[PDB]
Each structure stands twice: as structure tokens, then as C-alpha cells.
Design a protein around this ligand. Structure first.
Ligand SMILES: C[C@H]1CNC[C@H](CCc2c(F)cccc2NC(=O)CC(c2ccc(F)cc2)c2ccc(F)cc2)N1S(=O)(=O)c1ccccc1
Ligand SMILES: [Cl-]
Ligand SMILES: [Cl-]
Ligand SMILES: [Cl-]
Lengths: 99, 99
């Protein structure tokens, strides 16, 4: 699809068999989602935002569907204001910015 | 142009007669630039997200040039860790997400 930016680019994602809403964010290096249970071991990670840095849990090789497109990669879990799909997964689904 | 997301989508912008590097961020509602002087009236605003909130100065009707494309809109100025071109100005240059 072609998504304009007059409104927030919110799409449906599927992770752990559950549908959630997430923001497609070209300004985020990584994908970060609100608290939920993910399988496997996690590693520590710090991510920096507008207001400073936060600690998150890093899960690797997580299956996630984004607007119907399959991705498998790193998902961070932490106290984010909204679920965010960052460049690590936007590249997997072949997303580009065009003007 | 078509910009891939293998690395941060950093572009050169021209604002207040200064050349600056800024991130094209579909996850940002507003455009926020590091401390600089801008002409006209301003009002305080709080913007937030990962890490919490920061106080910024809101300047309206500011002209920006992004990749040769002129756009006018509100520009927030404050202690952001990176200059961000948010949706309020990405729409004006006809920027879309495509996959
Ligand atoms: C550097 C950029 C890159 N991601 C976007 C974000 C924009 C911040 C921003 C601006 F810059 C300029 C003007 C406004 C704002 N804020 C919003 O638009 C609010 C928004 C939001 C989005 C992501 C957040 F994390 C936090 C909040 C929001 C959407 C839906 C909702 F219901 C409630 C809030 N920042 S970040 O937090 O630092 C960050 C850095 C690394 C990874 C993730 C995020
Ligand atoms: Cl990944
Ligand atoms: Cl505006
Ligand atoms: Cl349009």
C-alpha cells in the first residue's frame, strides 16, 4: 500500500496470535512494543527517545505480521507510549519513503 | 526521491537561513529542531514519547526547505537529541510510505 501522513500511520500487526495497533516509524531504529509475553530469552537494551533513555527487553527472531506482510526479527518490549515498528522490520517488509 | 530504510533517513534542510541535518520521521506528529533562533512569536509546549517529555518553544508559519521542496508549518525548538521532520511538514512535500 501507499500510506499518506495526514494522520498517524497506524496499522494492524499480529504478534503471538494477537492483533494490535502499531505506528510505522521511520525515525525509530528498532521496533518496540508495550508489555506482553514473548517466547525465549531476552537481552538488555537501552533506547533513546525525545525525553531520554529507557531500558527494554530485547527478544530476537520474533514472528510478526505487519499490515499482512510477514517479518521475523528483533522486537523490544518496554514502556513505550505506543507500539512502534522501526526500521529493522520496515526494511523486511520493503517499506520506503517516497516524495 | 525514494529513500530506503537500511540506515537513518537523514536529509539536509534549510531553516532560519541555516543548513542542518534532520531525520525524516513518520512516527513524529510535529517537527522539532535543536536550539536556534527563529523570528516571530512563540508559545511553550510539551512534547513526549520514549524517555518522557521535553519543553519546547512553538513557532508558527516557519518556512523550511527539505531536498529542494519548500514547506511551511509549525516548528518546535528545544532540547531534542536529533533534528526531526515530523508529519506536519512531511505531508507538505508529498512524502508517503510505500510497501
Ligand atoms: C526520535 C523519534 C522517533 N520516534 C517517534 C518519536 C517522536 C516524538 C515526537 C517528536 F519528535 C516531535 C513531536 C512529537 C513527538 N511525539 C509524538 O508524535 C507522540 C507519539 C509518540 C511516538 C513515539 C514515541 F516513542 C512516543 C510518542 C505518540 C503517538 C501515538 C500516541 F498514542 C501517543 C503518542 N521520537 S522518540 O520518542 O524519540 C523515539 C526514539 C526511538 C524509538 C522510538 C521513539
Ligand atoms: Cl531484526
Ligand atoms: Cl503545521
Ligand atoms: Cl496527499
Amino acid at each position: 500500500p501507499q500510506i499518506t501522513l495526514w494522520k498517524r500511520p497506524l496499522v494492524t500487526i499480529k504478534i503471538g496470535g494477537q492483533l494490535k495497533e502499531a505506528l510505522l516509524d521511520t525515525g525509530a531504529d528498532d521496533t518496540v512494543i508495550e508489555e506482553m509475553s514473548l517466547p525465549g530469552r531476552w537481552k538488555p537494551k537501552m533506547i533513546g527517545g525525545i525525553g531520554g533513555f529507557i531500558k527494554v527487553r530485547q527478544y530476537d527472531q520474533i514472528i510478526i505480521e505487519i499490515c499482512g506482510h510477514k517479518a521475523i526479527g528483533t522486537v523490544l518490549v518496554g514502556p513505550t507510549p505506543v507500539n512502534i515498528i522501526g526500521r529493522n522490520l520496515l526494511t523486511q517488509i520493503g517499506c520506503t519513503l517516497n516524495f
